Amino acid sequence: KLHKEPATLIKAIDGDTEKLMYKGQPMTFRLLLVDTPEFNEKYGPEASAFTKKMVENAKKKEVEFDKGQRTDKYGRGLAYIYADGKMVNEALVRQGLAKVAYVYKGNNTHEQLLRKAEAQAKKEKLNIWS
Ligand SMILES: Cc1cn([C@H]2C[C@H](OP(=O)(O)O)[C@@H](COP(=O)(O)O)O2)c(=O)[nH]c1=O
Ligand SMILES: [Ca+2]
């Protein structure tokens, strides 16, 4: 079982990265197990807008680390991010705005959950899958 930790919004970045204050440190969090298009790729601006609004509209922001690496080689936090209890990683995938991606054995607690979301988005031919 993982645990959710409080964090506070600093600023949006793009569909799968967000800047949060965590334990008094400004950190870029990269979302586990997903990949949104880069900002100037198709669906890029939409995935950016979706993550940005989902986070900044939530009263309660939380980060949840997995069991393995907590930071990548760039110093970004690797986490599942929750906004009023809804997981952003999952919501992007469900809406066809991110693919399941960067799936590593240390750090794949929510893999089945996100794959179930992805299969729904592909069935519906949403966005990336249209
Ligand atoms: C999601 C994720 C990305 N990364 C690294 C892999 C890629 O590094 P390399 O470019 O060195 O191969 C990079 C992709 O992030 P972005 O999709 O944000 O560009 O982030 C991890 O190390 N672990 C992860 O869980
Ligand atoms: Ca990306």
Curated annotation (Swiss-Prot):
Sites where the protein binds Ca(2+): 16, 35-36
Source species: Staphylococcus aureus
Superkingdom per UniProt: Bacteria
Residues of the active site: 30, 38, 76
Subcellular location: Secreted
Compositionally biased tracts (Basic and acidic residues): 110-126
Designated name of the protein: Nuclease A
Residue span of region Disordered: 110-130
Residues of the full protein shown: 88 to 223 of 231
